[PDB]
Amino acid sequence: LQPELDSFKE
Amino acid sequence: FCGKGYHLMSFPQSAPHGVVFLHVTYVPAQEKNFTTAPAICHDGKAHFPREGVFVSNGTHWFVTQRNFYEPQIITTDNTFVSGNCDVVIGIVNNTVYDPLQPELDSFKE
Amino acid sequence: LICAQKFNGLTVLPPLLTDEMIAQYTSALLAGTITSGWTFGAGPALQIPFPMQMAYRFNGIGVTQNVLYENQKLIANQFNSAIGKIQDSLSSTP
Ligand SMILES: *[C@@H]1O[C@H](CO)[C@@H](O[C@@H]2O[C@H](CO)[C@@H](O)[C@H](O)[C@H]2NC(C)=O)[C@H](O)[C@H]1NC(C)=O
Ligand SMILES: *[C@@H]1O[C@H](CO)[C@@H](O[C@@H]2O[C@H](CO)[C@@H](O)[C@H](O)[C@H]2NC(C)=O)[C@H](O)[C@H]1NC(C)=O
Ligand SMILES: *[C@@H]1O[C@H](CO)[C@@H](O)[C@H](O)[C@H]1NC(C)=O
């Protein structure tokens, strides 16, 4: 979750 | 071994010079034919169901357990990916609705 | 001798199920297994594409579903070669 979430959000 | 069908329980009953069993089995009924598929390619990667099977109400595609028909939307929690979707024979195409993506998009966008 | 089995008051009764209906039972069982897996043995026979039933049986021994599908041709060749070899195995050893 965290890598994809950060990639989308940042 | 214990009654015809999928066994659930067995209540013994005493009899003269013997025993009597009451095998409580589970017998499926009211079957319905459905168009299946070994896997569902979404983004070039095959998706196989973690449990159950892929079934199609003629038009839409769903994933449900084998011994009962509870159609469920094909999400990425019901299916696991394994490799690309060019080597599985009989693969169909569809859209595995990921629960996280629209959730986060509605949250942020 | 087996040709004249009457002998002296020695009757050999014929089996109730002759070889033909036994073979019919075996063929029906084969068709049930092939086209319905285990479903026909526990209620109505529900048709299920063979490779999919094979994947189901693979799931029962530990290997995941995709092991068969990505190896379907290999497994089919292995199965057909083994079933070919079994006949020669029976013939070679009397
Ligand atoms: C399969 O196909 C139909 C037609 O595509 C599906 O209909 C849709 O799905 C919902 C939920 O079941 C139905 O209530 C609606 O009529 C349709 N709306 C949507 C969301 O597209 C339906 O799932 C199945 N029914 C049939 C005809 O077997
Ligand atoms: C699933 O979708 C993919 C991509 O949309 C399809 O792949 C295309 O297949 C055609 C063959 O008619 C090729 O000409 C295209 O180049 C392919 N596109 C890409 C980029 O993969 C695939 O055919 C679909 N599969 C099914 C069974 O519908
Ligand atoms: C499903 O359809 C097939 C072919 O149309 C038919 O032979 C079969 O009996 C049907 N099965 C059920 C349970 O509806």
B54: β partners: B63
Q: Is the CB of B14 under 6 A from ligand 3?
A: no
Give the separation between CA B23 and CA B1, rounded to whole angstroms.
10
Q: Is B65 left (phi over 0), alpha (psi -120 to 50) or beta?
A: beta
- The technique by which this structure was obtained is cryo-EM
B76 within 8 A of B98, measured Cβ to Cβ:
yes
Give the separation between CA B61 and CA B70, rounded to whole angstroms.
12
- Which residue numbers in chain A precede an interruption (C–N > 2.5 Å)? none
Give the separation between CA C94 and CA C89, rounded to whole angstroms.
9
- The H or E element spanning position C58 is helix C50-61
Alpha helical stretches, state H, C3-43: 19-36
Give the separation between CA B38 and CA B48, rounded to whole angstroms.
7
Give the separation between CA B35 and CA B55, rounded to whole angstroms.
6
Closest of B23, B24, B40, B34 to residue B70, by C-alpha: B34
Name the resolution in angstroms: 3.5
CA angle, B106 then B100 then B76, to 5°: 145
Interface test with B, best of A1, A6, A8, A9 (most B CBs within 10 A): A8
Give the separation between CA B36 and CA C52, rounded to whole angstroms.
9
Give the separation between CA C38 and CA C43, rounded to whole angstroms.
9
Size (chain A), residues: 10
Q: Is the CB of B30 under 6 A from ligand 3?
A: no
- b/e map C51-86, b = 16+ CB within 10 Å: bbbbbbebeeeeeebbebbbebeebeeeeeeeeeee
Question: Encoding tokens for residue B37?
Answer: 């598929």
